[PDB]
């Protein structure tokens, strides 16, 4: 149950700041490194305000970083959560 | 716990340049590969100012500070210990 809680601690890092679900098409804020689903952060920047939902820095959709490995890490974490 | 699942994840969180665990992890905005701050800064000074992986123009400032990287590194360590 300790390997279990380590997995869960990692999974928590790779959850969307906005919807707190596991990340789909992860995007990372360049200024603070918080991760969001593409759709979530797109909707935020587009319907809420042009700033990072966590760090509040000005932010346009195109400054967002594609976290290319996120989907693999996320799938692996799924495998681990038996 | 699948050993290779864990190892796959650990590969992601090794420094592309020195292969060790990340120290003050930075991420290349263009390909999102991770490097120790010190390693990538040396690289950019010594080698062409290109990501050692994306090979794309990369300067010190475009570098993303991965604030959660240490946390993950620490947990990975515990996971790897759990070979027992
Ligand atoms: Zn931010
Ligand atoms: Zn989301
Ligand atoms: Zn390094
Ligand atoms: Zn790169």
UniProtKB/Swiss-Prot annotation, chain B:
E3 ubiquitin-protein ligase required to prevent centriole reduplication. Probably acts by ubiquitinating positive regulators of centriole reduplication. Mediates monoubiquitination of 'Lys-119' of histone H2A (H2AK119Ub), a specific tag for epigenetic transcriptional repression: associates with some Polycomb group (PcG) multiprotein PRC2-like complex and mediates repression of target genes. Acts as a proto-oncogene via its ability to monoubiquinate 'Lys-119' of histone H2A (H2AK119Ub): overexpressed in a number of breast cancers and promotes transformation of cells by mediating silencing of tumor suppressor genes. Associates with the PRC2/EED-EZH2 complex. Belongs to the TRIM/RBCC family. Induction: Overexpressed in a number of breast cancer cell lines. The modification N-acetylmethionine is found at residue 1. Ubiquitous. Highly expressed in testis, while it is weakly expressed in other tissues. This is E3 ubiquitin-protein ligase TRIM37. The gene is TRIM37. It comes from the Eukaryota. It is linked to Mulibrey nanism: An autosomal recessive growth disorder characterized by severe growth failure of prenatal onset, constrictive pericardium and progressive cardiomyopathy, facial dysmorphism, and failure of sexual maturation. Additional clinical features include hepatomegaly, muscle hypotonia, J-shaped sella turcica, yellowish dots in the ocular fundi, hypoplasia of various endocrine glands, insulin resistance with type 2 diabetes, and an increased risk for Wilms' tumor. A zinc finger (RING-type) spans 15-55.
